[PDB]
């Protein structure tokens, strides 16, 4: 497993529901953002523009342990491990300010697809970026 | 102006914020859905797949007059008028169940663009569908 | 496990991303809608308005097997099983038109919380509604 | 009119649609975030938690002049002017990197409501924060 990467996410009105906490599907959005920052979003845009390759989530196993509130700045904490040429495993967690446990945990499995939905190996330049 | 078209929208947890009403940007989503139903979404998909044409909102003038609540089934009420070969004007309103006034009003101006963001005339088959 | 319930979901511009398929976090929204229709959304609104009880997803294990496209009307197929007084297990699947396999699978575990985030038994009136 | 405030927004997969640009309703989300940063989101949370006051958009007049693309970091540029005790007028613009014109323009009118949807004057502490 890699080191832990950190990405802040602020909770705005778009993120909450009428129950007073973050609406749960939004956590996968925050996890997506955080993976982009590990990879480098400019490299993702170049890879898609120039080669029509992009990544897809194959599996996501989520645990929602605590409610996250409006105006919190949470830390998305991410690590990755390579699992062969095709798969990347991500551990991602949402931590509320000062918390002693993750509010949300995800174990995510990612693949790389072309525009025909065929699996492709993770490009070396992406892996380089991820490990830089 | 055309007749009024009706499209129901149910308000789920994804639609509300912690203030207890629908989060205002979502109303433009509902208006988008309702326009698709006037046009025929299958025709929109064929037009984009086969010709790379699609529509874009150029202007949206919104009035938010009342809060919409969880579990309401609202009526999106839409009419259109053609304004030359390029522009379509839409009047769209969200009506809460039993209400005597619209909760949300939009005056929307739509154009048709190719993939290079060039303005194109509204295709006759789209206009036919809209007026069918 | 209950019978399979069916809930249609149409894919609009709000649902897709620039890769040309549904953006994966949105599937959990569709699953949420479908659970509301099993439960009865009016009962959920009365339970929250009158008693300040509502449901929360504790776990969601997702498999994303195929990309879903613009203008498809998918079928969300849902079943539930009770697992004691506190937990409800849901199996939910997105089926593209005419498909021979689910595009998306979720195994969801749901709890019932009060406003203090304390676990509560599923109310009998909710269970009645679910089994009606 | 106040000075111009700046708030960056990065465009992720959640922001785009299959046409390859930002899905237009999302711009109002970015405008909402930017207003929170002018006001101070902690003050908004305290005002809602302690007094049950919050702000609402009454009017939004939007112009969408250019498409915004994946992985861009745009600048949301905001100014405000007070229009009596009840209303606040906001001018908000999305600027793509290096652009010579705004991609999106909004003229937004904001009010302050209690939980009964009654109009209230903008609290002095909010105005202080806004002008700090």
The dihedrals phi and psi of D2, each to the nearest 5 degrees, come to -70, 175
Alpha-carbon torsion (C25, C31, C37, C39), positive or negative:
negative
How far apart (Å, rounded) are the C-alpha atoms in residues A47 and A120?
13
Chain A residues in contact with chain B using a Cβ-Cβ cutoff of 8 Å:
13-14, 16-21, 23, 25, 70
Tokens 């996501």 sit at which residue?
A: A60
Q: Based on the number of CB atoms within 10 Å of its own CB, is C111 exposed (0-12), middle (13-18) or buried (19 or more)?
A: middle
Q: Which member of C18, C28, C117 has the closest CB to residue A25?
A: C28
Look at C41 and B14 and tell me if their CB atoms are within 8 Å: no
> Could you tell me which residues of chain C have a Cβ less than 8 Å from any Cβ in chain D?
13-14, 16-21, 23, 25, 70
Cα of C32 to nearest chain A Cα, Å: 9
Q: How far apart are CA D95 and CA D106, in angstroms?
A: 12
The pair of structure tokens assigned to D95 is: 């600027």
DSSP letter assigned to residue D14: G
DSSP states along chain B: -PPPEEEEEE--GGGB-TTSSB-TTHHHHHHHHHHHHHH-HHHHHHHHHHH--EEEEEEEEEEE-S---TT-EEEEEEEEEEETTTEEEEEEEEE-TT-SS-SEEEEEEEEEE-TT--EEPPPHHHHHHHH-
Beta bridge partners, D83, equal: D87
Torsion angle, CA of B125/B126/B130/B131, rounded to 10 degrees?
Answer: -30
In chain D, which residues have their Cβ closer than 8 Å to the Cβ of A44?
Answer: 70-71
- Token output for D85: 């005790």
The Cα-based distances of A28 to A6, A80, B20, C3 in angstroms read 15, 16, 23, 29
Coil, helix or strand for C39? helix
Has A18 been labeled as part of a binding site? Answer: no
- The CATH number covering residue B49 comes to 3.10.129.10
Name every chain B residue with its beta carbon within 8 A of the beta carbon of C70.
41, 44-45, 48
- The residues near D9 (Cβ < 8 Å, ≥ 6 apart) are D30, D33, D34, D73, D74, D75, D76, D94
- Three-class SS state of A15: helix
Q: d(Cα D94, Cα D8) in Å, to the nearest integer?
A: 9
In angstroms, the CA D68 to CA D10 distance is: 10
Which residues of chain B does C56 touch, with a Cβ-Cβ cutoff of 8 Å? Answer: none
Phi-psi region of B15 (alpha: psi -120 to 50; beta: other; left: phi over 0): alpha
For chain C, list the strands marked E by DSSP: 5-10, 54-64, 73-83, 87-95, 104-113, 119-120
Asked if C121 contacts C112 with a C-beta cutoff of 8 angstroms, the reply is yes
HSE of D23 in the Cβ direction (CA atoms, 13 Å)?
26
> CA of A23, closest CA in chain B: separation in Å?
7
Q: Write out the two tokens for C20.
A: 């040309």
| Cα B74 to Cα B68: distance, rounded to the nearest angstrom | 8
Query: Helices B41-51 and B26-39: crossing angle, nearest 10°?
Result: 80
Q: At A35, list the tokens.
A: 């993976």
d(C-alpha D100, C-alpha D95), whole Å? 8
Supply D51's token pair.
Answer: 């007094």
Contact state of D28 with B28 under an 8 Å Cβ cutoff:
yes
Q: Cβ separation of A70 and B18 shorter than 8 Å?
A: yes
3-class SS of residue D119: strand
Please count the CA atoms within 13 angstroms of the CA of A45 that sit on its side-chain side. Answer: 16
Question: Which of C35, C43, C126 shows the shortest CA–CA distance to C85?
Answer: C126
d(CA B83, CA B81): 6
CA B26 to chain A, closest CA, distance in angstroms equals: 9
Q: What is the C-alpha separation between D55 and D110, in angstroms, rounded? A: 7
Tokens at residue A88, please?
């990347």
Measured in whole angstroms, the distance separating CA A119 from the mean position of its chain's CA atoms is 19
| A67 token code pair | 């409610």
Beta bridge pairs of residue B57: B110
Which residue in the set D18, D25, D63 is minimally distant from B59, CB to CB? D63
Cβ-based contacts of B10 with chain C (< 8 Å): 33, 41
CA–CA separation, A97 and A75 (whole Å): 8
Binding residues of B: 51, 125
Nearest-angstrom CA–CA distance, D132 and D123: 14
Range of the domain at B5: 1-132
Residue A124 DSSP one-character state: H
C114 DSSP assignment: -
Sign of CA dihedral C78, C83, C84, C86: negative
* Number of independent structural domains in chain B: 1
**Whole-number Å distance between alpha carbons of B76 and B53:** 25
Alpha helical stretches, state H, chain D:
26-39, 41-51, 124-131
Task: Give the residue carrying structure tokens 């659970």.
Answer: C35
Determine whether the interchain pair D18/C23 forms a contact, defined as Cβ–Cβ distance below 8 Å. Answer: no
Question: How is residue C22 annotated by DSSP?
Answer: B
Q: Which residues pair with C87 in a beta bridge?
A: C83
Which residues have a Cβ under 8 Å from the Cβ of A107 and sit 6 or more positions away?
Answer: A59, A60, A61, A89, A90, A91
Report residue D25: phi and psi, to 5°: -60, -25
Closest CA to D54 of D109, D108, D110, D114: D114
CB-based contact D24 B59, cutoff 8 Å: no
Report how far residue A58's alpha carbon sits from residue C63's, in angstroms, rounded to the nearest whole number: 6
Strand partners, D16: D22
- CA dist A35 and A26 (Å) reads 15
Q: Is A122 helix (H, G, I), strand (E, B) or coil?
A: coil
CA distances for D60 relative to B32, B62, D5, D56, angstroms: 16, 5, 19, 11
Interface contact flag, D57 B63, Cβ < 8 Å: no
Distance CA(A62)–CA(C106), nearest Å, equals 11
Pairing of strands C119-120, C87-95: unpaired
Q: A123: closest CA among A38, A43, A56, A59?
A: A43
Q: What are the φ and ψ backbone dihedral angles of B102, each rounded to 5 degrees? A: -65, 140
Q: Compute CA distances D65 → B117, C21, D31, whole Å.
A: 10, 25, 16
| Residues 6 or more apart in contact with residue B98 via CB below 8 angstroms | none
Q: Are C70 and C11 in contact (CB under 8 A)?
A: yes
Look at B60 and D56 and tell me if their CB atoms are within 8 Å: no
- Three-class SS string for A39-90? HCHHHHHHHHHHHCCEEEEEEEEEEECCCCCCCCEEEEEEEEEEECCCEEEE
Whether B13 and C30 have beta carbons less than 8 Å apart is answered as no
CA-derived radius of gyration, chain B:
15
8 A C-beta contact, residue A58 and residue A109:
yes
Query: Is there a contact between B20 and A17 if contact means CB atoms under 8 Å apart?
Result: no
Interface test with A, best of D39, D41, D46 (most A CBs within 10 A): D41
Would you list which residues of chain D are within 8 Å, Cβ to Cβ, of chain A?
10, 12-14, 29, 32-33, 36, 41-42, 44-45, 48, 69-71
Distance linking the first and last C-alpha atoms of chain C: 15
Cα C28 from Cα C12, distance rounded (Å): 16
Experimental structure resolution, Å: 1.0
């Amino acid at each position: 497993m890699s080191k832990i990467y950190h990405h802040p996410v602020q909770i705005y009105y778009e993120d909450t529901d009428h129950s007073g906490v973050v609406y749960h599907p939004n956590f996968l959005k925050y996890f997506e953002r955080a993976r982009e920052h590990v990879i480098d979003s400019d490299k993702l845009a170049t890879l898609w523009n120039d080669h029509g390759l992009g990544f897809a989530v194959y599996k996501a196993n989520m645990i929602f342990q605590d409610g996250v509130e409006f105006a919190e700045i949470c830390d998305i904490r991410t690590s990755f491990t390579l699992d062969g040429k095709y798969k990347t495993l991500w551990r991602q967690e949402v931590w509320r300010p000062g918390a002693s446990r993750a509010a949300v945990i995800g174990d995510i499995e990612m693949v790389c697809l072309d525009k025909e939905k065929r699996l492709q190996p993770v490009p070396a330049d992406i892996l380089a970026s991820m490990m830089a």
